[PDB]
Amino acid sequence: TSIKPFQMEDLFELNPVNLDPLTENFNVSFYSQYLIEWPQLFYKSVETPNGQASGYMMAKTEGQLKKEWHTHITAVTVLDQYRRIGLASKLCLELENLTQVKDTLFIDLFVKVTNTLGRILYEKLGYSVFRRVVGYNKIDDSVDAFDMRKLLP
């Protein structure tokens, strides 16, 4: 895998990833908002030999009390052909290399309470369950979630 910045026109070539039944395909405005506000936190994995996107990360930063900032993962997905080789773990770990992320206090994310898979994935990356949260197309957003956090240096 190699990592490249995400560009809007990648949306036209993402169906192998975004036809996955747990991978939402958002509005144009949502993708473009992440590219506008946190352009470095929207990057894609790419494979040899044609440069096809094997996955992507959409993350953001968010301010609180706003004297205190953290990064938030909104979406990680990996093409089926390139699963179980640590690509998702690499996309999440690459955030910790970005100086915009390093300047925040922690990274958090939401995993549904029923997604024992996702929790373990993030647990293996150093995240721990911080707090259960209420919830309220492909995913029932009314299901409770775990906010998971990883403190940063």
Next chain:
Amino acid sequence: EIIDFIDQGNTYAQSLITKKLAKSPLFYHVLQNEIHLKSGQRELAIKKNLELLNRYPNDPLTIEKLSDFFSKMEMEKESSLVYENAIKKYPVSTETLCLSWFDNSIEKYDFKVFNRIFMYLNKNGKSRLHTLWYAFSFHLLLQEGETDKASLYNSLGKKLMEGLQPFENTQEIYVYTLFLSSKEIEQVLSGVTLPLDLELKLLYMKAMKENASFEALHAYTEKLLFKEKFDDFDTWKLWILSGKEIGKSFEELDQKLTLPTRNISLLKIELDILYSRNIETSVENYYQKFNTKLCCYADLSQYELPTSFIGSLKNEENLITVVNNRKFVNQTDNWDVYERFSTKEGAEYDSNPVNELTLRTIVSDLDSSPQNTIKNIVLLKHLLEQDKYNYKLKLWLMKLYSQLNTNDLIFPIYNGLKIRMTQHETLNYYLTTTNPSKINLDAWVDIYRFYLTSKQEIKESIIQGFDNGVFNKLEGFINFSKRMQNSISLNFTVAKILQISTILGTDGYLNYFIHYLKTNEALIVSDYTDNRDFKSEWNGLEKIDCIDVPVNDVATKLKLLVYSIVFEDQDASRLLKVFNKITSNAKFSVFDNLLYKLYFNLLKITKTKLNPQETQSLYNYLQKNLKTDKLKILIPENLLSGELTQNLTNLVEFIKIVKLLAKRHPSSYMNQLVNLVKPFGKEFKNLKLVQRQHEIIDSMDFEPPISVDISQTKLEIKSSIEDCVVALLNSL
């Protein structure tokens, strides 16, 4: 303004309302009056709008409409001069005028206008942001190819950016690099004190490589890889490349390759190639580490594999090991492995890797015969019972159904994939053969509302991307918008709405989409962009010549012309000339060539002024051929082919349009065409297209490769053929 909306919607109370409002007054209403004239007759309207331009309007709404009017008449000179004259005359309103100019101009991607707007805005502008806009706009222009201006455009952008030093962020530095040589890029990026982002790091490495700065690149890549935990294959390749270039031994490089990671395992192959060594052992080492991973085949097959490695095709327990091995030996007979791993296991939303093999077997077996298509429909559905979210199987199932008159059955699959928003632009065409039902019509309107939503969202993205500084991403926003403005999938969506609307009697939608056509004639007649996805159903497979969804892109354009002409009230001759040029070069089936000739003769006779002899010639051809004995050629010799309901649907629509024109333009010869089409429904029913299709299906024998029930699918397919065909016959 309320009176103006009534004028637009049209038409006699409009001129009276403006005659009253203007009699009270000012420049706005005169611009209105002369638009209403344009809606009646235009040569006066241009003279009259030119008259308004010279009075220097000074009001934003009036300026916008003028510039709109002149651009509508291919008078780009004047559409720009309205704003320029206002800025010249009232330079305090420069920013406000320029932003209206720009916001209204985005839809029309005239980078000379962007750059012209930014020029005015930067002259009467105390704005670093505006200087960046102007500079970035020179890059945009350079992306168009007036090579004789290229040197000037590059010099002006470079000098504008140099004026902004020192740079405050990586976006400004990015813009500067758009005007620099590879040599200058390295020199510039090597002195940057700000932390580089990924965009500029990649650019820095590409520049060093192009400059043959192999010491600097080996040092730089080594830092990223061994000290900043980047772990990036492209960066690894540059590291071994530059390492060799500066004289490093193979052993010196390989001794640093200690971690058995995927990228390093592949790199060892790349390092053997780079040092003219034997590939074999590093191919075997990658395979031993990664044969249990679905990636193995795609990673190795890009190299030239030794025939000894493949020779290990002798006699496994791990399903994915078998999948890779069967791919390496390109084996297409894989039901034996399916029978060993038919049960879905693991995570509920994962696909079963066995169906990488079964799909290859199914695709290799496809021969376009309807018995083979139905057999493989049964197999795809059977696999999907246990592998319920496998999208590749779903896409193929829709392709197979698209070969038949089972037009009933595609939408449930498409909707079960939860296609939404931009996926409609890329996957729409899978619905090409869907039946003209009301539920499908409402679904198509829903698809069109995505287009309305995306158009407004991307415009705002472009505005915010400029307001914020995000030149890293702006070109992609603009290109996204451009590709979406006039795509074949958008125009197909409109054509499909119109067709179903006229087949059903639902005029609620028709009036909105007729209004779109007359609003966007310039696009309808232009060349459409294509962003359709013909690849995802082949992911991990080798694309071969197989069955296709039967798209017809030229017919889509002609359908929109047809409706544009039907509802043309002033002069249809220009649209008929476009129509006739397109049919002259159309690449159609026999029936489609007749259909559009029939259409052309029908529209010429109803929507143009002809002498009586031209009328009679065009009408005689309609008279001779509006007969089932002539139109039967729409029936394919393979009655199960989906072309039957495609052509029949087009015949039904054509007859509906005959009836519409007979009302709007009554004549003895139109009433005779209405009379001629009367027995079609009876005459086509007597051909018994349903029964004969049911008989062919019942006579087909089936020796499926796995245990399945054919029966339930035969019944569903026979019922679907019946329902879809009978709906059409009753609509004749």
